[model samples]
Target: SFSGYLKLTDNVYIKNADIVEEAKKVKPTVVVNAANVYLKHGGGVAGALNKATNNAMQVESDDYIATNGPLKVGGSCVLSGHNLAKHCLHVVGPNVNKGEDIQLLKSAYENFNQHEVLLAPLLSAGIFGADPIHSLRVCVDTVRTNVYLAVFDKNLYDKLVSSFL
Candidate 1:
């Protein structure tokens, strides 16, 4: 269920819930994953998306990275043929508890080309263990419109909601 929203730009708004569900509704042209450098889809948003797309995400992701080479930290790759969304932007975020800086997370967002609808999680805040509030704020400040921030957990969701209030 939807709790509330905060408008970041004329077109960009903050949405909270299971990202997979939210992506289903928004049907973004691009959906971003805070992925590992190796492009593994073991857990978290990556796993959910893989399951949602019936392994299409993994297959496509592997192919994309194979041609492009492994994604460097703070770098990203783009994939199509995903059923949930037109494109999946796979970003290799920083490692957990080590150099999990804002620039690294911001770099991923900066790499994204403009699209009508975009969905992403709190980058580096999950397996990479970055600060959720800071990570979310960086995303809100970076992008302009048609972006959704999917908050899967209750605590982080509350913090995000309180940021504006």
Candidate 2:
């Protein structure tokens, strides 16, 4: 199978593969992490980013929270200083165990509007329990910038492709 690019819209893109692999090949202008209030980056795609960035996600997260404020649900913290991309945008997604939290996830994407290129996970689709297809679509719909939805699971890839047709 070819590693192709799907245009979710004129500016939005969906990529099915290991995000870290894509990051290594072509570094995005910004890396958006589906984070939490704690800024732990302990699970989901955040965890992968933690490993990819040598744990700098947590380190910078702690400092960002202390100086700014807890990155509340729907809010974001943009950080740098590591090889995790030109910028790392930490955004708190909703706890889907409660309910559909589309607004919070949308808010996260709002933070990166007008960007040239961005690499982001499907917010709330992992530990958050939100519908993967819906969340990815929402991310694509909400962003004004060009977006790249990083996909690792085969199911997510299939569903993403299905949405296009």
Candidate 3:
């Protein structure tokens, strides 16, 4: 088991936990999802959130996409509160398949920086294939608002203290 916390600044923090679970344990916090442009919730945080919320995400996402079109990398959209969180902030991150770009990852975190209270999983770092450590670095480096990062992978959690140091 691995769990730890770091105070990165007066308002920024890193907490080793599952983003989804942490949101449930705490009330009314927005969650950051590393989403596909389509917002399919097929895997990782997206998938887990969809599963936890019992397919409500797909219904909301479909509505958003129907109105907004497919989300683009470095862009974001908000979904209403669900059983798991106060709201879901979806951001499409750079995927290696789309052409490797760290700047896009930085911009993804740029979206993450706006929330007053936030819990985040590493953006695009899972099956999307960006390096997890570097992804955490982007999160660490970019946060300016009140935030707590939730790391789901045990290995990544193990690396958190040193990774952020």
The residue pairs that clash in candidate 1, if any, are 11-146, 12-145, 12-146
TM-score of 1: 0.84
Model 2 lDDT tens row, 1-165: 114777778877787778777766677768887778878878788888888888876888888778887767877777872676888777677877866466677776677684667887777877888888777767767888777877888887887788663
Mark the 10 consecutive residues where model 2 has the least summed lDDT: 1-10
lDDT of 1 by residue, 1-165 (tens): 223556655645566578888778767778888788878888888888888888878887788778887888888877772676778888776766666555777776665545556777878877678878777777667765566677788877777777743
Q: Give me the overall lDDT of model 2.
A: 0.76
Q: Please, what is the whole-model Cα lDDT of each candidate in the order they appear?
A: 0.73, 0.76, 0.78
In terms of lDDT, the best-performing candidate is 3
Best by TM-score: 3
Every model's TM-score = 0.84, 0.88, 0.89
Off by over 4 Å in 1: 1-4, 8-11, 98-102
- Give per-model CA RMSD: 2.8, 2.7, 2.8
lDDT, model 3: 0.78
Clashes of each: 3, 0, 0
Q: What residue pairs are clashing in model 3?
A: none
Residue range 1-165, candidate 3, lDDT tens digits: 113557767766677777777877774468777788888988888899888888999899998889888987878888865887778898888888667576888888888777877777778787888888888777767867777778777777777667565
